[PDB]
């Protein structure tokens, strides 16, 4: 069959620079059936280019397509902040993996906070410890939970916001979920954050019961 | 103008079936094929199959052959897509699309969210994220609710700067959960009241939890 | 010994025809192995008209009393990689379908399997040496889900399920 490989998975670019999105086909295909799409969060895909290079109606001229054989390229001459979306290439019913185009800004270190479980939630028999990473770039960040120096695993979930429309930073939350029985078996609860903007990893901890 | 309007969102239990509609307008409904594309949460696009509205012929993807059936009604220009024997991993958004000539999908529907879960409608529990020892952080923990969505507001819209409402995460119990946080000056604590306004339309739940230190 | 096809209404014996070609639709998606699946055409009259191997008989799925190939089966398509484009099969040796008159037309089992193997042979030249499977129609209106044809002003519908249920390696 036909396999469409898009690279990179995530493209970071400073506002106003040129974008270059590639679509590699596993076999030699015809340019008359190469299509490009743009999908913003919460919306349906929007047709940008069809036939490898023919621009659709209503599409700004800063979008361009080219290529033949196995390599095809979607080009954004001047990246606009409104151009942040996921882009797919299409060959008949085959779709590419998608390339996320985000804004690249200067490195911003996160502000790390930690929140013990509230006494009301402990009444229900569940403890939720929250580690907050606020306003950082790039997206890559490592958060580790350690309870009495024991590295936790399989009991935490992370959630990341969309890139902020103004400062172009991200915010992350890591929620450690324990029961009241296991939460009261230990004393020290800490989350360590390793990020490019930090000269050294930051640790926020607390003792159960102050 | 050509436009496609799809049916509303659906909440089904595992093993049941769902039927999605797609009403076309602005062109001769029998002149172009109707395709369907699936997109799981946070995933890519996946083609399901096309339907010839003039003859009723279909061509389903091999991975969906057996559980999908696509029909249409020409007198109302509406195409249908039914998916039987739903599983938990079948939770996705289904689009109907039309090409300029075939595959150049320039016209899409708004999408139909189809979530498969054995959970029932449940309101959330709002717990505080109290601040402790210039900038202090506090928030609310919106935990255990179904289904989505849940709106969060701070001080009835008077506090918006520095607010971060995280997307919900699907817990292992089948219930959703999220957190909303905001950074405020440390001196504002004690003197300024901070109220998080949580609403849950499916369960008619409205909670106004006050976040205090200690 | 023969392949009996249920037809409605009952075709009289003078409506027996010569099967000279087929029209197919390759099933899309991603298979799990080296298997390519074909079904009766899921399109409409435009797929049949652009075949141009038919005669005066108006028919679906199967071409009755149409153009035969000179030597061997000739398959053609506008894009072999577009599953929305039908695959036009033109036979070289016609296969006779004999209608009794009680609502069922007969087709020899061996001579239909011989033609399906020659068709699967020509299909491997376009899709590589893989497993060719024929499956019944994916559905549709009565004139297209069934093998339909006209004869003397009347219109007949014959279920073609038994004709497309084989696997060739
Ligand atoms: C096909 O040709 C035969 C022989 O001439 C004729 O008897 C028959 O009616 C034709 N079939 C149709 C469907 O017209
Ligand atoms: C098919 O063609 C052969 C050769 O012309 C002829 O003898 C035979 O009667 C035809 N069969 C039908 C049903 O028309």
Domain of A38, CATH number, reads 2.60.40.10
**Which residues, in sequence order, are CB contacts of A160 under 8 Å at separation 6+?**
A139, A170, A171, A172, B166, B167
Domain boundary among A79, A103, A127: A103
For A34-65, give the DSSP string: EEEEEE-TTS--EEEEETTTEEPTT--TTEEE
Per-residue CA distances from B90 to B11, B39, B118, C28 (Å):
11, 10, 13, 20
How close, in Å, is residue C142 to chain A by CA atoms?
Answer: 27
β-pairing, A10-13 with A99-103? parallel
Q: Which atom of ligand 2 is nearest to the CA of C98?
A: 13
Q: How many CB atoms lie within 10 A of CB C90?
A: 23
**Which residues, in sequence order, are CB contacts of C110 under 8 Å at separation 6+?**
none
Question: Are A93 and A179 members of one domain?
Answer: no
State how far the Cα of A171 lies from the Cα of B119, in Å rounded to an integer.
29
Cα C96 to ligand 2 centre (Å) = 7
Question: Are A72 and A122 members of one domain?
Answer: no
State how far the Cα of A12 lies from the Cα of A20, in Å rounded to an integer.
11
Question: Are A91 and A182 members of one domain?
Answer: no
In Å, what resolution does this model reach? Answer: 2.6
Question: Are A117 and A48 members of one domain?
Answer: no
A57: which 2 tokens?
A: 């109606």
Residues A164 and A170: beta-carbon distance below 8 Å: yes
Cα C22 to ligand 2 centre (Å) = 17
How close, in Å, is residue A56 to chain B by CA atoms?
Answer: 8
Residue that the structure tokens 């580790």 belong to: A144
Check B62 against C37: CB less than 8 A apart. Answer: yes
Question: Are A94 and A29 members of one domain?
Answer: yes
Question: Are A198 and A126 members of one domain?
Answer: yes
**By alpha-carbon position, which residue is closest to atom 12 of ligand 2?**
C17
Contacts of A157 in chain B (CB under 8 A): 169, 171
Neighbours of chain A (3+ CB pairs under 8 A): B, C
β-pairing, A142-147 with A150-151? antiparallel
Contacts of B100 in chain A (CB under 8 A): 47, 50
DSSP secondary structure code for residue B50 in this structure: E
Q: How many structural domains is chain A composed of?
A: 2
Q: Helix (H, G, I), strand (E, B), or coil: what is residue B107?
A: strand
Domain ranges of chain C: 2-168
Question: Are A15 and A70 members of one domain?
Answer: yes
**By alpha-carbon position, which residue is closest to atom 13 of ligand 2?**
C17
**Chain A touched by B195 (CB under 8 Å):** no
Element (H, E) at B76: none
Contacts of A115 in chain B (CB under 8 A): 129-130, 139
State how far the Cα of C147 lies from the Cα of C10, in Å rounded to an integer.
13
Residue that the structure tokens 């030249």 belong to: C125
Residues B119 and B144: beta-carbon distance below 8 Å: no
Question: Are A52 and A77 members of one domain?
Answer: yes
Question: Are A152 and A194 members of one domain?
Answer: yes
The candidate with the shortest Cα–Cα distance to A128, out of A143, A116, A119, A112, is A116
Question: Are A146 and A79 members of one domain?
Answer: no
Q: Does domain C2-168 have CATH number 2.170.40.20?
A: yes
- Rg of chain B (C-alpha set): 22
State how far the Cα of C81 lies from the Cα of A29, in Å rounded to an integer.
9
State how far the Cα of C107 lies from the Cα of A31, in Å rounded to an integer.
44
Domains defined along chain B, listed by start: 3-116 (2.60.40.10), 125-210 (2.60.40.10)
**Which residues, in sequence order, are CB contacts of B75 under 8 Å at separation 6+?**
none
Cα of first residue to Cα of last residue in chain C, in angstroms, is 23
- Rg of chain A (C-alpha set): 23
Domain boundary among A103, A132, A166: A103
The candidate with the shortest Cα–Cα distance to B67, out of B87, B45, B51, is B87
State how far the Cα of C97 lies from the Cα of B168, in Å rounded to an integer.
63
- Domain residues for A129? 111-207
Question: Are A132 and A81 members of one domain?
Answer: no
Check A175 against B169: CB less than 8 A apart. Answer: yes
**Which residues, in sequence order, are CB contacts of B101 under 8 Å at separation 6+?**
none
Residues B113 and B148: beta-carbon distance below 8 Å: no
Domain boundary among A103, A135, A159: A103
Method: X-ray
A194: which 2 tokens?
A: 């390793």
Question: Are A67 and A30 members of one domain?
Answer: yes
Q: Helix (H, G, I), strand (E, B), or coil: what is residue B29?
A: helix
How close, in Å, is residue A33 to chain B by CA atoms?
Answer: 8
């Amino acid at each position: 069959d036909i396999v469409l490989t898009q690279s990179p998975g995530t493209l970071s670019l400073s506002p106003g620079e040129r974008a270059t999105l590639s679509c590699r086909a596993s076999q030699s295909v015809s340019s008359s059936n190469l299509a490009w799409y743009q999908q913003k969060p919460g919306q349906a895909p929007r047709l940008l280019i069809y036939g490898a290079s023919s621009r659709a109606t209503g599409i700004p001229d800063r979008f361009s397509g080219s290529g033949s054989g196995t390599d095809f390229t979607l080009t954004i001459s001047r990246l606009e902040p409104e151009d942040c979306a996921v882009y797919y290439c299409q060959q008949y019913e085959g779709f590419g993996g998608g390339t996320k185009v985000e804004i690249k800004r200067t490195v911003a270190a996160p502000s790390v906070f930690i929140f013990p479980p509230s006494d009301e939630q402990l009444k229900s028999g569940t403890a939720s410890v929250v580690c907050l990473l606020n306003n950082f770039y790039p997206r890559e960040a490592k958060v580790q939970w350690k309870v009495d120096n024991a590295l936790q695993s399989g009991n935490s979930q992370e959630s990341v916001t969309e890139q902020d429309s103004k400062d172009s930073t991200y915010s992350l939350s890591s929620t450690l979920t324990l029961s009241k029985a296991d939460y009261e078996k230990h004393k020290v609860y800490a989350c360590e954050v390793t990020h490019q903007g930090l000269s050294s990893p930051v640790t926020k901890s607390f003792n159960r019961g102050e | 103008q050509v436009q496609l309007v799809q049916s509303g969102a659906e909440v089904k239990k595992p093993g049941a079936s769902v039927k999605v509609s797609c009403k076309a307008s602005g062109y001769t409904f029998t002149g172009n094929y109707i395709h369907w594309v699936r997109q799981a949460p946070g995933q890519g696009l996946e083609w399901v199959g096309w339907l010839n509205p003039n003859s009723g012929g279909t061509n389903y993807a091999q991975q969906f052959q057996g559980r999908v059936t696509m029909t249409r009604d020409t007198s109302i220009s509406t195409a249908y897509m039914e998916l039987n024997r739903l599983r938990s991993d079948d939770t996705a958004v289904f689009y109907c699309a039309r090409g300029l000539w075939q595959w150049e999908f320039r016209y899409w529907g708004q999408g139909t969210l189809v979530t498969v879960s054995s959970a029932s409608t449940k309101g959330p529990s709002v717990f505080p994220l109290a601040p402790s020892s210039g900038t202090a952080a506090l928030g609310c923990l919106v935990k255990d609710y179904f289904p989505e969505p849940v709106t969060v507001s701070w001080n009835s819209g008077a506090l918006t700067s520095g607010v971060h409402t995280f997307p919900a995460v699907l817990q292992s119990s089948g219930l959703y959960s999220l957190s909303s946080v905001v950074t405020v000056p440390s001196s504002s604590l004690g003197t300024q009241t901070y109220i998080c306004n949580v609403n849950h339309k499916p369960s008619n739940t409205k909670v106004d939890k006050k976040v205090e230190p200690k | 010994d023969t392949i009996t096809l249920p037809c409605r209404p009952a075709p009289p014996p003078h409506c027996s025809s010569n099967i000279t070609g087929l029209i197919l639709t390759r099933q899309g998606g991603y298979s799990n192995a080296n298997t390519v699946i074909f079904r009766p055409s899921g399109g409409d009259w435009r797929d049949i008209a652009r075949c141009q191997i038919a005669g005066t008989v108006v028919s679906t799925q199967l071409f009755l009393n149409g153009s035969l190939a000179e030597e061997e089966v000739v398959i053609r398509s506008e894009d072999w990689r577009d599953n929305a484009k039908s695959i036009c099969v033109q036979l070289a040796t016609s296969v006779e379908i004999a209608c009794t008159g009680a609502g069922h037309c007969a087709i020899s089992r061996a001579k239909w399997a011989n033609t399906l193997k020659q068709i699967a042979s020509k299909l491997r030249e376009q899709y590589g040496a893989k497993t060719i499977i024929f499956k019944p129609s994916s559905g549709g209106d009565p004139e297209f889900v069934n093998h339909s044809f006209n004869c003397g002003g009347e219109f007949f519908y014959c279920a073609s399920t038994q004709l497309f249920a084989s696997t060739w390696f």
